[PDB]
Symmetry: C2
Subunit: 166 residues, 2 copies
């Protein structure tokens, strides 16, 4: 019989996603500020290179109220597919993180951090059943780690701590 | 000549403190919920065992407005003394973290995390120049890591990102 309570599993799964989202956000801002000229920042803002996004194909909830309509198993399933589409892609971001001065980026094996989160999500389901290319992929990485972090904070808030927030 | 900008050093110093504060808070709640009977939670709330706190002696700002009056070098000096008073004490919390199910507690060498933050703070200054005993110490650890995190988010907000918040 499983010996870790469901609420701890949802908490731990959200903490891992939040860490990956901080790492994705801060290395995305340091990169943009160090290397992308202002000219190119506004351009990409108005036309994102979502072709670079590995996850383009996975249908996700568009607003917080479409997110609230989704069941916990549905939100877990969507989070798993978004982590699974990054498992091979993230190797390309290795040089970004190796060059980053953001605490913990350079000595993080980000492939492992994602494999750990994918196993975290599967375990929860079982209980309930150069520059501009690096920049576009860091944008998509940040966009996706932001969603996963939101889908796991919702499941966490609806699960054994039935009042968590953000 | 120093090659990491002051704002990155203040950011990194705040990220390390925030991580230690999350770790201190979550292992304090898991411990309290797993092991301290409700009876003893209210009692300690109304009479904290601050004798257990290594930092009792260090004078800190009492409210956010006494914090705002302090200079950055003063707030750095106070944060350093609070990290330095934990360097020998934290070894006693080893079994707590080894038993914790909170992500990252059990394989963290928390002594090292504090030595890294102490060196972070010294570098910034140079630019500007069983159960109830474990519970009391985890309370003090959380109280102090909360302050350090606040003093470093203030310095960070006043330093090269002269508009950061929390």
């Amino acid at each position: 019989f499983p010996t870790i309570p469901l609420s701890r599993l949802a908490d731990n799964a959200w903490l891992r996603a939040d860490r990956l989202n901080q790492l994705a956000f801060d290395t995305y801002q340091e990169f943009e500020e160090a290397y992308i000229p202002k000219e190119q920042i506004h351009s990409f803002w108005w036309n994102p290179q979502t072709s670079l996004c590995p996850s383009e194909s996975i249908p996700t909830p568009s607003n917080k109220e479409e997110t609230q309509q989704k069941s916990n198993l549905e939100l877990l399933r969507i989070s798993l597919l978004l982590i699974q589409s990054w498992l091979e892609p993230v190797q390309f971001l290795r040089s970004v993180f190796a060059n980053s001065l953001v605490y913990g980026a350079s000595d993080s094996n980000v492939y492992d951090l994602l494999k750990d989160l994918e196993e975290g999500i599967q375990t929860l389901m079982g209980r309930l059943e150069a520059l501009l290319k690096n920049y576009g992929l860091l944008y998509c990485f940040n966009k996706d780690m932001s969603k996963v972090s939101t889908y796991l904070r919702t499941v966490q808030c609806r699960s054994v701590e039935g009042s968590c927030g953000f």
